Amino acid sequence: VLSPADKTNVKAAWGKVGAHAGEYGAEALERMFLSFPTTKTYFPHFDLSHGSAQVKGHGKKVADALTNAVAHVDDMPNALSALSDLHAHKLRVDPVNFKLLSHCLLVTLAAHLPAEFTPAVHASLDKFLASVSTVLTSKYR
Amino acid sequence: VLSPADKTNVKAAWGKVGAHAGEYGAEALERMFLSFPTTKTYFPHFDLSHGSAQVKGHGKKVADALTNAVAHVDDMPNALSALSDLHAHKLRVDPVNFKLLSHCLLVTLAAHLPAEFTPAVHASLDKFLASVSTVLTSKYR
Amino acid sequence: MLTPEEKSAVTALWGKVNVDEVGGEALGRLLVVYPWTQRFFESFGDLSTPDAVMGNPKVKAHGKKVLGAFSDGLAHLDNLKGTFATLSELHCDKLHVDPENFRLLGNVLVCVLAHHFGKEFTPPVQAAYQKVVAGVANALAHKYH
Amino acid sequence: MLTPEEKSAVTALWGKVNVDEVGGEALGRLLVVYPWTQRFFESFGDLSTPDAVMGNPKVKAHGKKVLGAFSDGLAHLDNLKGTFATLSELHCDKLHVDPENFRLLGNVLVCVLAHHFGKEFTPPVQAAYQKVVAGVANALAHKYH
Ligand code: HEM
Ligand code: HEM
Ligand code: HEM
Ligand code: HEM
16 A cells, blocks of 8 residues: 555656656666566567667556556556556566566666655655556456 | 455365364464475574474464454455554564465365365465465555 | 485375376466466467366376476486476577466475375475475576576 | 676676665665564664664664675675575574565665666666675575574
């Protein structure tokens, strides 16, 4: 559960991400693939080389989605339903991988927002990625 | 999320455990301590040797807890609230440990219910245990 | 990675295992308990229900190969990596199987074992078998990149 | 442990690190990002708020001893087990710490390295580092029984 504070911290930091988000998505991706090489098992149809149109377009769809979750942190389930359906019924990405991406997402954030990334925002984004992960995985079985 | 089939399965199998639960509790622990010795990190005060009443006793507690859950399957969070507090604010058992004990439980169910442990009930039980786990670590942060 | 007593405990119990029967149960159970693993077997046919799954011919067939291969490693419990090197590589390079699955399998397996052996699959034998599966999962993931 | 190219990055960045500074931050965020990890520090006094924690002097002392130990570690990337043996044992028999806490830290640490180094923390250095946090965690769990 994201308390009000958490919600505050997320929208705040997400905001600062602003129009960088997409390229944020694309670096988090590249960071997962290089750090957690097993995650590439879900992307054999992708040119996974640095600066791929694919990864960038993908990092972009990812971010959009997060911007949506943030825009709707009080109704993540319906906000993300379409995507929880596709994740459970089409991509079927094992749930351990959500956590790996949450991680590289934190890393991306930390490194792009030297001011906003305090212990309490860190905490909050963590709880929040953990929450997104859950919505998306909720319909797995 | 626990479907109607899942609840039936759960109640059915839990039904059979009947007054065995406490015994199945202790065994489950024992399975845990030997299979995943990291889990012993939480019981330095316990005599962990085979037959230990301590294990038996904690075994009993767990099973009754699990019994309450089943009884209140549609109202777990409030059913388990006193126990989500205790884990979160006092025991503060890493969340990953709840999956080890879950498996151990399943394992013990398996070995004592050759008729009832169908692939379908196996499924329901994992589900249900995951749900109990979620509810017990719901207030960790 | 197993002590003298755990090796004895694993071997003994594997003696009583009809690899084919266990193989189909485990593979079938994976698919029922963790439906997302169905992602690698869209050819296998109907996986719509526990039933369809469990009785599907390809599940059983496939399950047999797997555990046949699992069985081969039991033999070389001291070269667990060396042994699965070719398989590690194929699951990566051609199958694109997230190594996580090997872990779901080992657990489902332990479950199958226990169900089948009841009171014989004791805390201590399970312990020995938790090590083996883990060892197997790691051996198969070893060449992932 | 890693490719030479990878150690070099690793030792290169850490060159520019304030073990005491990072120590305390890492330990602190661990205690904030994962409150359950606090269980071991109830003699550390006040931990009631993120500010208390980050400010607590003991957490600060703790943070620097853990992390200097980590530092000695980096010099032995070819023997983390050799290095962490006794320290694994104590964590095990005396401290009773769940090795997961070691992974949580490791994760917190990379976060800390990224905030602290911005863009010099490229995906590759990240990776290199991920191997090292994985490695050290692996090495402290290692004597657990
Ligand atoms: C932060 C959690 C995640 C979010 C919000 C997210 C979101 C998305 C979205 C919005 C799409 C595209 C949907 C469409 O095209 O309509 C997508 C596709 C995809 N995602 Fe997820 N995802 C997440 C986690 C993961 C993880 C952890 C993996 C793999 C390890 C993964 C694998 C995939 C793949 C394989 C595709 C489709 C490939 C393609 O379209 O060509 N996702 N995801
Ligand atoms: C669904 C799984 C679990 C349930 C239902 C459960 C429930 C309980 C219950 C009912 C008690 C006693 C409550 C009281 O005294 O009021 C308890 C205590 C405790 N549990 Fe949990 N628990 C679970 C998982 C775990 C796990 C996975 C661990 C560690 C691996 C753990 C460690 C402990 C400890 C250390 C105590 C305190 C006992 C003592 O030292 O006196 N629990 N738990
Ligand atoms: C101990 C674990 C495992 C072992 C030893 C193993 C072994 C094998 C072997 C030997 C083959 C090739 C059959 C032959 O020799 O012709 C195979 C193929 C395959 N395995 Fe694995 N496997 C394991 C676990 C898994 C898991 C957990 C999954 C996915 C959930 C999986 C997915 C596949 C697939 C999709 C194929 C190709 C089958 C086909 O052609 O349709 N395996 N495996
Ligand atoms: C990179 C990871 C770590 C390293 C290298 C490490 C190293 C150390 C060292 C060198 C000591 C010696 C202290 C003594 O003799 O009292 C110590 C103690 C301790 N560690 Fe760890 N540790 C690590 C991770 C952790 C983590 C993640 C936690 C917990 C949540 C933890 C909890 C403790 C505690 C409670 C003590 C005892 C301190 C005292 O007695 O004053 N450690 N650690």
